[PDB]
Write a protein that binds this DNA or RNA. Structure first.
Ligand SMILES: Nc1ncnc2c1ncn2[C@@H]1O[C@H](COP(=O)(O)OP(=O)(O)OP(=O)(O)O)[C@@H](O)[C@H]1O
Ligand SMILES: [Ca+2]
Ligand SMILES: [Ca+2]
Ligand SMILES: [Ca+2]
Ligand SMILES: [Ca+2]
Length: 341
DNA sequence: GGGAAGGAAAGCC
DNA sequence: TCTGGCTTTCCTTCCCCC
């Protein structure tokens, strides 16, 4: 199998640069303003001009401004990025019927039936990069290898505006030399548990007692890492279908007063229904982020679709259950719908 | 013994 | 200072079915 992975560069910030070319060369920071106070919220992303200074996804906007007070700060316009992403995904479908859209800016294409070797795969990658640059002015990084995981690692190694092939020989080298923390699916918590077992490389998971590995990181992640280390990871490219849609908002001030929370909860329901667009959910979950930042949720599944009026009434009962069962104040409140008909 | 199902944990965008 | 958002697996409990 030959997998070609596409990952758009500094996507949100780059789209803003495409829509306003005068921004190019300047540090641009895309913000997610929570509306709680002046500049409260976090950075969604920033272009490398800003990132090279530590301004990146997830840091508080206030911290970003301490680092680059003169950068351009723009509020996220997800809908615009989503429409642009959709057009690019449509261009990629021309290169393969087997495509897995993984996120707003990533796609895996199985090009096994399209090219004969990595030389041809590489040339197709260039063709794709040029087509997207021609049509949308967006640069991307392409990663090519024998499976999805290595195709993604290839992209990580080449971004931004790059292309890289990790052939069979290099896959074996990486199994021995790649920091295991850099393997997709291994976050800080799993990386710490592994470091604690002396596991710093994929190859190391083959010499540890399986039960010891499984007991520390779980059966699925252990089987996952071992399959990669054995160079036997096989996962087909599959069409993805969204399984959940929701909206969660930040309240002006923390609270556990039902009447004060309701307006936010109902606003989150309205926006969620707008985002469902014809999809009818059979399940609704009310999700609350407590003052200490913990996440609590209560849901209900119906034997039928949930009308908006039913979403309103059931959401209150679920929020009451959250308040009746938890003692903390709520900071953020929302809903999530799933189990579509 | 183990499949489902609810909610938390963890991962990545 | 900690936005928003989606997916998958984990842990626990029910019950032989969902
Ligand atoms: N923590 C986050 N909060 C809000 N939006 C995010 C977050 N992480 C990523 N995104 C959005 O999704 C997009 C893709 O994620 P990614 O981590 O690839 O960022 P990027 O800006 O595209 O950087 P890169 O050049 O590494 O590909 C970004 O433009 C942004
Ligand atoms: Ca990525
Ligand atoms: Ca990207
Ligand atoms: Ca990692
Ligand atoms: Ca049951």
């Amino acid at each position: 199998m030959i997998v070609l992975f596409v990952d758009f560069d500094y996507f949100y910030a780059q789209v803003e640069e495409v829509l306003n070319p005068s921004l190019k060369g300047k540090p641009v920071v895309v913000c997610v303003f929570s509306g709680r106070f002046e500049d409260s919220g976090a950075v969604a992303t920033a272009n490398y001009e800003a990132r090279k200074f530590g301004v990146k996804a997830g840091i508080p906007i206030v911290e970003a401004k301490k680092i680059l007070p003169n950068a351009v700060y723009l509020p996220m316009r997800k809908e615009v990025y989503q429409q642009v992403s959709s057009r690019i995904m449509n261009l990629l479908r021309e290169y393969s019927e087997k495509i897995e859209i993984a996120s707003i800016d990533e796609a895996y294409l199985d090009i096994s039936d399209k090219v004969r070797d990595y030389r041809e795969a590489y040339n197709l990658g260039l063709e794709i990069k040029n087509k997207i640059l021609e049509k949308e002015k967006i640069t991307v990084t392409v990663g090519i290898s024998k499976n999805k995981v290595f195709a993604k690692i290839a992209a990580d190694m080449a971004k931004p505006n790059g292309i890289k092939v990790i052939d069979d020989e290099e896959v074996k080298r990486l199994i021995r030399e790649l920091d295991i923390a850099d393997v997709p699916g291994i976050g800080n918590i799993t990386a710490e548990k592994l470091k604690k077992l002396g596991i710093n490389k994929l190859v190391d998971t083959l010499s540890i007692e399986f039960d010891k590995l499984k007991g520390m990181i779980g059966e699925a992640k252990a089987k996952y890492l071992i399959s990669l280390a054995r160079d036997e990871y096989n996962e087909p490219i599959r069409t993805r279908v969204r399984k959940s849609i929701g909206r969660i908002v930040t309240m002006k001030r923390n609270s556990r007063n039902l009447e004060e929370i309701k307006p936010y909860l109902f606003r989150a329901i309205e926006e969620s229904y707008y985002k469902l667009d014809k999809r009818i959910p059979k399940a609704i979950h009310v999700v609350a982020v407590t003052e200490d930042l913990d996440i609590v949720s209560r849901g209900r599944t119906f034997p039928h679709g949930i009308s908006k009026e039913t979403a309103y009434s059931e959401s209150v009962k679920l929020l009451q259950k959250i308040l009746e069962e938890d003692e903390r104040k709520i900071r953020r409140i929302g809903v999530r719908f799933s189990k579509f008909i």
